[PDB]
Design a protein around this ligand. Structure first.
Ligand code: X8Z
Ligand code: YB
Ligand code: YB
Ligand code: YB
Ligand code: YB
Ligand code: YB
Ligand code: ZN
Length: 607
């Protein structure tokens, strides 16, 4: 049961292909065009079917050259409106037909953000980008909006000629629009079957630079050079990921650096990963987000969650490969460092949600829950924690890596549940069932709170972080003079980050300690977004008013939800900044990403 979709389920019928012809109207902020769905019946005598839509205007539905009848049901809030279509002939099992739907999106589409020129880098051209995961594809085009169905797709997209269109597919040529010489048509082909959440579109003043044999980076002109250097490890990480997961099947692996309002670190669109510009630290230090996006080329994009209830499958395996890529690159001690970090993140979200909250369960029941509201680090880190525990139980990384690659090969091109995964684990490790039977499955998969067991972590790189954070916590006023810029000389950027994460977990500290920290370590100068984030949270939670313009500025100048949401919540929890926080949210709202706007609104209780 896909409880997030209102469409006919895969048991009734399945989309096999989408042919999208559309046009991006910046003046109206709509996409207008036709989606031709090739639909296969999975039942005898099939006479109608249902698709998901959200805020779509339907002009007509044509099958076999004639218009047919359809109806739109009433709005079911965030699930949108079900669209029922009457087929002009009854279909037998496995018969196919092509349904061509003429449609137009709302300017308020939850899939889309429309940017004026002044909201971009170059200031001369507007920009558009999509984010379909989880259930926003329906807010672009009628479809069975469920990751239980995989289709191939072709598209032709008409844009103003001075702009560039890209999708989650291979570029298949461009020509002038023959109906409007002020527009170009860009063509695309996705030959590998994908869930519709993986359909993506960007349109903007984009340039490309090549950075490895099957990778171009794309961004506006002003970001190209910085991005090319920042993501230069991409091919070596692709090679390591092929070694762990088997052949990369997607042809190209290009990267697109989005504007600052992009809501996530990354989105694994096939052929074209989207990333936040907040990765551009200048030293490649945030490149684990590229390792993660690459790993999704296997776990998520080849083997996919059957419904969003089983999202941990996508994210937990991807974090598990991500941390192996970083470990082959930087050493096993560093993999442990990141894993132990991941645990503290899990501790953080459990504490923020409460230890009985349903959203701290690994497998979540999303009946009547908007997946955007349920989204957190839990499936990433509780999922990773489960895999890391099994790895240790089952005889170490080399052994558990053979399972990962077999699992990927078993379920390639399929959509699967937690039970499918577990069955295969039991079958793969048949000779270790007795070990597998010591696992508290009910607790790990279905209980809220921290898992019932904590893995074993090497401490080598973490100890210096803990040691410095503990010095600061236990320091009294007469001890502040002992801290010095030399305390940091042997810490990597990752260790500075993790010193601040440890210290943040015991926030607030006295305001005098925080001011000293700034005096001796000058964290205010650091532009690494992860480090800056945690330091500003430390400052605001410790009630340093000087930090208020700095936190508001970071919260609004980018819109990665990982940063924007905790900053606004911290700023709203501080009496001194409460009113500016609400006011700035309100003045920025209209020009925020729509999912980000909604979430920060809920977080702040505004509207
Ligand atoms: C690296 C992943 C890609 S699925 C991501 O963007 N995350 C993971 C949880 C937070 C959020 C973020 O970094 O903004
Ligand atoms: Yb029949
Ligand atoms: Yb007509
Ligand atoms: Yb071609
Ligand atoms: Yb079994
Ligand atoms: Yb003392
Ligand atoms: Zn991911």
């Amino acid at each position: 049961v896909d409880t997030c979709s209102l469409a006919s389920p895969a048991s009734v019928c399945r989309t096999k292909h989408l042919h999208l012809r559309c046009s991006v109207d910046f003046t109206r902020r709509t996409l207008t065009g036709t989606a031709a769905l090739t639909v296969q019946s999975q039942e005898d005598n099939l006479r109608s079917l249902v698709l998901d839509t959200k805020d779509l205007t339907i002009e007509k539905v044509v099958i076999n050259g004639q218009e047919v009848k359809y109806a739109l049901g009433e709005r079911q809030s965030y699930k949108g409106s079900p669209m029922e279509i009457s087929l002009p002939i009854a279909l037998s099992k496995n018969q196919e037909i092509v349904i061509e739907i003429s449609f137009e999106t709302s300017p308020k589409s939850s899939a889309l953000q429309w940017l004026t020129p002044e909201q971009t880098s170059g200031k001369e051209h507007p920009y558009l980008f999509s984010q379909c995961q989880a259930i926003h594809c329906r807010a672009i085009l009628p479809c069975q909006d469920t990751p239980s169905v995989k289709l191939t797709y072709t598209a032709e997209v008409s844009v103003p000629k001075e702009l560039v269109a890209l999708m989650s597919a291979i570029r298949d040529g461009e020509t002038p629009d023959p109906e409007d010489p002020s527009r170009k048509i860009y063509k695309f082909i996705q030959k590998v079957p994908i869930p519709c959440y993986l359909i993506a579109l960007v349109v903007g003043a984009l340039e490309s630079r090549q950075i490895g044999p099957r990778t171009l980076v794309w961004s506006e002109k002003e970001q190209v050079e910085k991005s090319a250097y920042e993501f230069s490890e991409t091919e070596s990480m692709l090679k390591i990921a092929e070694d762990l997961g088997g052949p990369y099947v997607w042809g190209q692996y290009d990267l697109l650096v989005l504007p600052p309002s992009f809501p996530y670190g990354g989105m694994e669109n096939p052929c074209l990963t989207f990333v936040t510009p907040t990765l551009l630290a200048g030293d490649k230090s945030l490149s684990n987000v590229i390792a993660h996006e690459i790993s999704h080329s296997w776990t998520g994009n080849l083997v996919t969650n059957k419904t969003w209830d089983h999202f941990w499958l996508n994210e937990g395996h991807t974090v598990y490969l991500e941390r192996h890529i970083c470990g082959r690159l930087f050493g096993e001690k560093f993999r442990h460092f990141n894993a132990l970090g991941g645990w503290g993140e899990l501790q953080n979200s459990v504490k923020t949600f409460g230890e009985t909250h349903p959203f701290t369960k690994l497998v979540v029941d999303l009946t009547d829950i908007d997946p955007d509201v349920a989204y957190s680090s839990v499936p990433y880190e509780k999922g990773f924690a489960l895999l890391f525990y099994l790895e240790q139980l089952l005889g170490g990384p080399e052994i558990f890596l053979g399972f990962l690659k077999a699992y990927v090969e078993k379920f390639s091109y399929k959509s699967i549940t937690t039970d499918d995964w577990k069955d295969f684990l039991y079958s793969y490790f048949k000779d270790k069932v007795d070990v597998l039977n010591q696992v508290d499955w009910n607790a790990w998969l279905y209980s809220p709170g921290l898992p019932p067991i904590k893995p074993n972590y090497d401490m080598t790189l973490t100890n210096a972080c803990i040691a410095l954070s503990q010095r600061w916590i236990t320091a009294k006023e007469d001890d502040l003079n002992s801290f010095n810029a030399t305390d940091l000389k042997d810490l990597s950027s990752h260790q500075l980050n993790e010193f601040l994460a440890q210290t943040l977990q015991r926030a607030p500290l006295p305001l005098g300690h925080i001011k000293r920290m700034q005096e001796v370590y000058n964290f205010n100068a650091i532009n690494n977004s992860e480090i800056r984030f945690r330091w500003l949270r430390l400052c605001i939670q410790s009630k340093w008013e000087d930090a208020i313009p700095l936190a508001l500025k970071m919260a609004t100048e980018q819109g990665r939800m990982k940063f924007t949401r905790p900053l606004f919540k911290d700023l709203a929890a501080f009496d001194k900044s409460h009113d500016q926080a609400v006011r700035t949210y309100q003045e920025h709202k209209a020009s925020m990403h729509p999912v980000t706007a909604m979430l920060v609104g809920k977080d702040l209780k505004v509207d």
